[PDB]
Each structure stands twice: as C-alpha cells, then as structure tokens.
CSV table of C-alpha atoms in Angstrom, one decimal:
chain,number,residue,atom,x,y,z
A,1272,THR,CA,-19.6,20.9,81.0
A,1273,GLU,CA,-17.5,20.9,84.2
A,1274,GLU,CA,-14.6,19.1,82.4
A,1275,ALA,CA,-14.4,21.9,79.8
A,1276,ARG,CA,-14.5,24.5,82.4
A,1277,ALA,CA,-11.8,22.8,84.6
A,1278,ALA,CA,-9.6,22.5,81.7
A,1279,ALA,CA,-10.5,25.9,80.2
A,1280,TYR,CA,-7.7,28.0,82.1
B,28,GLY,CA,-16.2,10.7,53.6
B,29,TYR,CA,-16.6,14.0,51.8
B,30,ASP,CA,-14.5,17.2,50.8
B,31,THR,CA,-13.8,19.6,53.6
B,32,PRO,CA,-16.9,22.0,53.8
B,33,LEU,CA,-16.4,25.7,53.5
B,34,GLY,CA,-18.7,28.5,54.5
B,35,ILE,CA,-21.5,28.3,56.9
B,36,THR,CA,-21.9,24.7,56.3
B,37,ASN,CA,-19.0,23.8,58.5
B,38,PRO,CA,-19.5,21.8,60.9
B,39,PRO,CA,-21.6,19.5,59.1
B,40,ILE,CA,-25.3,19.6,60.1
B,41,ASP,CA,-25.5,15.8,60.3
B,42,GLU,CA,-22.7,15.7,63.1
B,43,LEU,CA,-24.5,18.6,65.0
B,44,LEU,CA,-27.8,16.7,64.8
B,45,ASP,CA,-26.2,13.5,66.3
B,46,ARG,CA,-25.8,15.2,69.6
B,47,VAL,CA,-29.2,17.1,69.8
B,48,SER,CA,-32.7,15.3,69.8
B,49,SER,CA,-33.9,17.8,66.8
B,50,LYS,CA,-32.9,20.7,65.0
B,51,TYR,CA,-35.5,22.6,66.6
B,52,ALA,CA,-33.7,22.2,69.9
B,53,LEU,CA,-30.3,22.6,68.2
B,54,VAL,CA,-31.2,26.2,67.2
B,55,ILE,CA,-31.8,27.2,70.9
B,56,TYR,CA,-28.9,25.2,72.1
B,57,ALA,CA,-26.6,27.2,69.8
B,58,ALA,CA,-28.4,30.8,70.1
B,59,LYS,CA,-28.2,30.6,74.0
B,60,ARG,CA,-24.6,29.8,73.9
B,61,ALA,CA,-24.0,32.5,71.3
B,62,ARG,CA,-25.7,35.0,73.6
B,63,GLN,CA,-23.5,33.9,76.3
B,64,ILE,CA,-20.2,34.3,74.4
B,65,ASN,CA,-21.4,37.8,73.2
B,66,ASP,CA,-22.3,38.6,76.8
B,67,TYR,CA,-18.8,37.6,77.9
B,68,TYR,CA,-17.2,39.6,75.1
B,69,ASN,CA,-19.2,42.8,76.3
B,70,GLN,CA,-18.2,42.4,79.9
B,71,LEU,CA,-14.6,41.5,78.7
B,72,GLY,CA,-13.3,45.1,79.7
B,73,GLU,CA,-14.4,44.9,83.3
B,74,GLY,CA,-16.8,42.9,85.2
B,75,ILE,CA,-17.5,39.8,87.2
B,76,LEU,CA,-16.4,36.5,85.2
B,77,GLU,CA,-19.8,34.6,85.8
B,78,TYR,CA,-20.3,34.1,82.1
B,79,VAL,CA,-17.3,31.7,81.0
B,80,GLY,CA,-16.2,32.6,77.7
B,81,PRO,CA,-15.5,30.3,74.4
B,82,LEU,CA,-14.1,27.1,75.2
B,83,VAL,CA,-12.6,26.2,71.9
B,84,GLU,CA,-9.9,28.9,70.9
B,85,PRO,CA,-11.6,31.1,68.4
B,86,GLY,CA,-10.4,32.1,64.9
B,87,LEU,CA,-9.5,35.6,63.6
B,88,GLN,CA,-12.7,37.5,64.0
B,89,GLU,CA,-15.1,34.6,64.2
B,90,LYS,CA,-18.9,35.4,64.8
B,91,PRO,CA,-20.1,34.3,68.3
B,92,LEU,CA,-22.6,32.0,66.8
B,93,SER,CA,-19.9,30.0,64.8
B,94,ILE,CA,-17.8,29.8,68.0
B,95,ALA,CA,-21.0,28.3,69.8
B,96,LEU,CA,-21.7,25.8,66.8
B,97,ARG,CA,-18.0,24.8,66.7
B,98,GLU,CA,-17.7,24.1,70.4
B,99,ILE,CA,-21.1,22.3,70.4
B,100,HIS,CA,-19.7,20.1,67.3
B,101,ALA,CA,-16.4,19.6,69.6
B,102,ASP,CA,-18.7,18.0,72.5
B,103,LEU,CA,-17.9,20.6,75.1
B,104,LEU,CA,-21.3,21.5,76.3
B,105,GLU,CA,-24.2,19.9,77.6
B,106,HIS,CA,-27.8,21.1,77.8
B,107,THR,CA,-31.3,20.4,79.6
B,108,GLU,CA,-34.5,20.4,77.6
B,109,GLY,CA,-37.6,21.9,79.1
B,110,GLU,CA,-40.8,20.0,79.5
C-alpha cells in the first residue's frame, strides 16, 4: 500500500 | 484469547483469513509477495530498486514466506482479485 511505501524509508 | 502461538502457526490463520476473501486467495496473496521479497533479496547486490523489499523489519534469518505472511497480518498490503 502507498502508505507503507511512503513510510518504508 | 489464547497462548502465544509458536512455529509456522504464527500469525494465526483466522486473523489472516479476516483480511482475504478465502484461503485459496490467501495462498496466492502470500506466495506472490514471497516471490517479490526473494527477488528483492536476489537483486540486493546491485540493480534497480523496482521491487520494494520487506515492509516489516525481518527477524534473524526469517524465510521470505514468513515475512510475507507477517506483513500481510500487519495490514500493510493491498491485493486485487482477477475475474
């Protein structure tokens, strides 16, 4: 999900 | 309400099924993400970071499928069902 990618790094 | 599961029974199956329509969809929803994680590990040395690696921080040598299941249980992925 886009939120997980945004907060991934 | 139960003792903490240990082994390949964690995370609990019921919580996983609460997210997916059925287990037949869950198996693919987990295996495809496991393949993605394995590809990311394979290309970790050098390559384009097109395949984003694991979302949840993995353990000490956790199999890719276990990471996929844990990150599915953590509600970090979304999937679209064909037909």
